[PDB]
Amino acid sequence: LDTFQGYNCYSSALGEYAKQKNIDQVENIILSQWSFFFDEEQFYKNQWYTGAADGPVDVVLNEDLRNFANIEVLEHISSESQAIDEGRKVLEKHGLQIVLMDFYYMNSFNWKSLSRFNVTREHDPHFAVLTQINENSVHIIDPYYHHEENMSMEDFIKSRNSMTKQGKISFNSYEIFSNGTKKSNIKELLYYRFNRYLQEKMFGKITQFGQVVKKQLDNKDRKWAFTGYNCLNSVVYQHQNLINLQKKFSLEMPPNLQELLDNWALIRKKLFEYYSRGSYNTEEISNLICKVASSEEQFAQEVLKVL
Numbered sequence: 209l210d211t212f213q214g215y216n217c218y219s220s221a222l223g224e225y226a227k228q229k230n231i232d233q234v235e236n237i238i239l240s241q242w243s244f245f246f247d248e249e250q251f252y253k254n255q256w257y258t259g260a261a262d263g264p265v266d267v268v269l270n271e272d273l274r275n276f277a278n279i280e281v282l283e284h285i286s287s288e289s290q291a292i293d294e295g296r297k298v299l300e301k302h303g304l305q306i307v308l309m310d311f312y313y314m315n316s317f318n319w320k321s322l323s324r325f326n327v328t329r330e331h332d333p334h335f336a337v338l339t340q341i342n343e344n345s346v347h348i349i350d351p352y353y354h355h356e357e358n359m360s361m362e363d364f365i366k367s368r369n370s371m372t373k374q375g376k377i378s379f380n381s382y383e384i385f386s387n388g389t390k391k392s393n394i395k396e397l398l399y400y401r402f403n404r405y406l407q408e409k410m411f412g413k414i415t416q417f418g419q420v421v422k423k424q425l426d427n428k429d430r431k432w433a434f435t436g437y438n439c440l441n442s443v444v445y446q447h448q449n450l451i452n453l454q455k456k457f458s459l460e461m462p463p464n465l466q467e468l469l470d471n472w473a474l475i476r477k478k479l480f481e482y483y484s485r486g487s488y489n490t491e492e493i494s495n496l497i498c499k500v501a502s503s504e505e506q507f508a509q510e511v512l513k514v515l
């Protein structure tokens with residue numbers, strides 16, 4: 209499909225809703241995001257431990273949407289008995305419902321395409337955009353993976369009432385709401401993000417990620433490398449969104465933005481290879497991560513200087 213990518217599952221869902229219904233401000237606020245996190249506790253619990261944002265809900269993006277656009281993303285919780293009639297009302301009023309779903313039931317990505325035939329099924333929260341309720345099925349978009357599908361009513365209800373690795377889903381839905389949308393200018397969105405990235409030392413979390421990778425040389429369980437590969441797609445997507453913003457709005461950027469994107473892509477390639485090819489190159493991967501930390505810090509300072 210030609211869906212809004214955003215930079216993560218949550219932002220893809222909000223942006224796809226905003227794109228379809230030409231809701232102002234949402235897309236530009238998502239596409240200007242500049243963030244990195246690292247959670248060492250999540251690393252050792254096999255949760256999505258790095259990349260743009262903790263999840264599944266990007267609470268930082270919710271704050272940016274409130275503060276810049278006066279846009280609230282309201283969490284709704286429902287029950288098995290009420291959830292579908294709630295959906296019918298939402299589809300009549302708004303045409304789309306953003307729902308939290310256990311990815312275990314979504315087909316979305318084909319790992320056999322990348323020669324990974326033994327991908328373990330995992331109970332992991334994800335987002336879908338519900339477009340249609342039938343008597344025994346629903347139609348959903350996964351905008352993050354540019355995928356749409358018909359799901360059985362049984363599988364849809366199961367997926368929305370699942371205990372996952374990152375919490376209990378109870379028919380959670382997300383409403384984009386405003387009392388009165390506020391306008392922002394593209395340089396204002398970027399200055400705020402790049403200053404916050406430096407003030408909160410987000411480049412430091414890249415270095416922390418690097419330091420933990422160095423310490424996995426004897427870890428027989430390489431799942432962390434696969435999890436890391438998936439988590440860092442959000443960073444590649446932010447780099448691509450900033451290049452796109454630069455072209456669209458004729459912005460002055462530091463000259464090494466595509467180089468940095470290429471650096472993150474190589475880290476992702478090396479983690480995927482480490483996961484599956486049995487190599488002993490934790491030090492090589494750690495070194496690349498610790499280098500990109502330094503380049504990203506200098507990049508953020510250069511954005512503030514030249515923008």
Ligand SMILES: *C(=O)c1ccc(O)cc1
Nearest residue numbers: 217218311332333334335
């Ligand atoms: C997004 O929420 C998401 C969740 C899980 C996988 O595997 C991929 C994407």
